[PDB]
Structure 1
Amino acid sequence: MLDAFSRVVVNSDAKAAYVGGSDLQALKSFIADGNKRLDAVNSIVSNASCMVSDAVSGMICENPGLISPGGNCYTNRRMAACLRDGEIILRYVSYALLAGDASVLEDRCLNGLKETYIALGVPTNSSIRAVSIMKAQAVAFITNTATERKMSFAAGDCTSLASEVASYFDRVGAAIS
């Protein structure tokens, strides 16, 4: 795994050079904007349990055939596996948001997830939608858009970190598609 600091190095070491001012002010701001990122991730850990229930029940609320007899989220054993998988995906997206890089999301989570689904018979269409509801919840929690719960913070703009998690979520979506 890598983070945001390591990815410029994997590049700086490939050019057999040091780390001057050129490729640093981007990293200089990252460290300076470290407070907003820690303010950002905490809002997802605070509401992680409600996010999967609002996501997976909304998946069935838009698709009642998953619980028709024979469906993927039909029985009591399969519902637990799907509610487990949703929270695993949310956990890795929170890892990638805290890291500032999607390296930990690729190899430990998305590398071998497509093959496991196709072989299991998990409907990608319904699985792909399950991530986008969580994306809509995350961008509301990061920019304090949650209409049911509000949190306390210092005022300002947080789209940067919010856009970083929106790009992570459909990166998850593109790998399992």
Structure 2
Amino acid sequence: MQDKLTSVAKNCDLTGSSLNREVVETLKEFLADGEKRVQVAGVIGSNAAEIVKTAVSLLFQEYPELVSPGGNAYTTRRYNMYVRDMNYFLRYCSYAIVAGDASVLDERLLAGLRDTFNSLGIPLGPTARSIQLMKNIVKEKLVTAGMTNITFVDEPFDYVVREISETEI
């Protein structure tokens, strides 16, 4: 996996344009938000359990059939698996927020995720909904902490959804 700086530096040699003006501008823009990325990751790590618990409770509110008999969140075994996987998603999204690059998600979260979920019958719609709920809760916590320009926080979660959701149109 790579972070933003590593990918940009390697692309500098790959593309043959070296350290031109556009690369310098993108590097400066990225470095301007680095402290905010670290702060966002700190907030996510300090409130991980609360975020996951809130998101899973809201998911079971919006999908009451999940916890009913025959549902996928039926029994504490599957409930614990739900919580565990949502923690996985939150952890790797925090990693991607720090790195500024989505390669960590590609290599350690999304590679083979669809195969696993098809094998185990894990529904993807509720998975995307839970990721979006976690994203909303993280945004609420960041607004509470006083952060202002936190658009990049949307990038991992949304991206993950786009990678796991099926094609409808």
Q: Give TM-score scaled by structure 2 length.
A: 0.89
Distance 2:156 2:91 in 1: 12
Query: 1:76, CA displacement in angstroms?
Result: 1.3
Q: 2:156 aligns with which of 168, 173, 176?
A: 168
**Hey, what's the Cα distance between the residues in 1 that align with 2:162 and 2:20?**
35
Give 1:141 deviation, angstroms: 2.1
Are residues 126 and 32 of structure 1, via their aligned partners in 2, closer, same or farther at CA, if it must alter by over 3 Å? Answer: closer
Compute the displacement of 1:65 (Å). 0.8
Equivalent positions of 1:22-171 (< 5 A) are 22-144=22-144, 151=145, 158-159=148-149, 162-171=150-159
Q: CA 1:96 to 1:67, structure 2 compared with 1: closer, same or farther past 3 Å?
A: same
Contact kept, 8 Å, 1:36 with 1:158, in 2: the verdict is no
Instruction: Assess, with a 3 A threshold, how the Cα gap between structure 1 residues 32 and 67 changes in structure 2: closer, same or farther.
Output: closer
Q: Is the 8 A contact 1:12 1:19 kept in 2?
A: yes
**Bigger shift: residues 38-47 or 13-22:** 13-22
In structure 2, runs of 5+ residues without a counterpart are none
Indicate the percent of aligned positions where both proteins have the same amino acid: 39
Greater Cα shift, 16-25 or 67-76 = 16-25
Q: Is the 8 A contact 1:86 1:131 kept in 2?
A: yes
1:35 Cα shift? 2.2
How large is the RMSD of aligned CA atoms in angstroms? 1.7
| Match status 1:7 vs 2:16 | no
Amino acid in structure 1 at the alignment position of 2:99: A
More helix by share: 2
Q: In the alignment, residue 95 of structure 2 is paired with which amino acid? A: Y
Instruction: Work out the CA distance in 2 between the residues paired with 1:136 and 1:163.
Output: 12
Distance 2:98 2:18 in 1: 26
Listed one character per residue, the Cα deviations across residues 155-176 of structure 1 (whole Å, up to 9, x for unaligned) are xx632xx221212101111122
SS in 2 for 1:23: helix
3-state SS of paired residue (2:23): coil
Once the two structures are TM-superposed, the CA of residue 10 in structure 1 deviates from its matched residue by: 3.1
Distance 1:21 1:123 in 2: 46
The 1:71–1:3 alpha-carbon spacing in structure 2 relative to 1, beyond 3 Å, is same
Tell me the secondary structure at the aligned position of residue 18 of structure 1.
Answer: coil
What is the Cα deviation at residue 62 of structure 1? 1.0
64-73 vs 89-98, greater mean Cα deviation: 64-73
Q: Give TM-score, length-normalised by structure 1.
A: 0.85
Shift of 1:17: 4.5
Q: Secondary structure at the match of 1:143?
A: helix
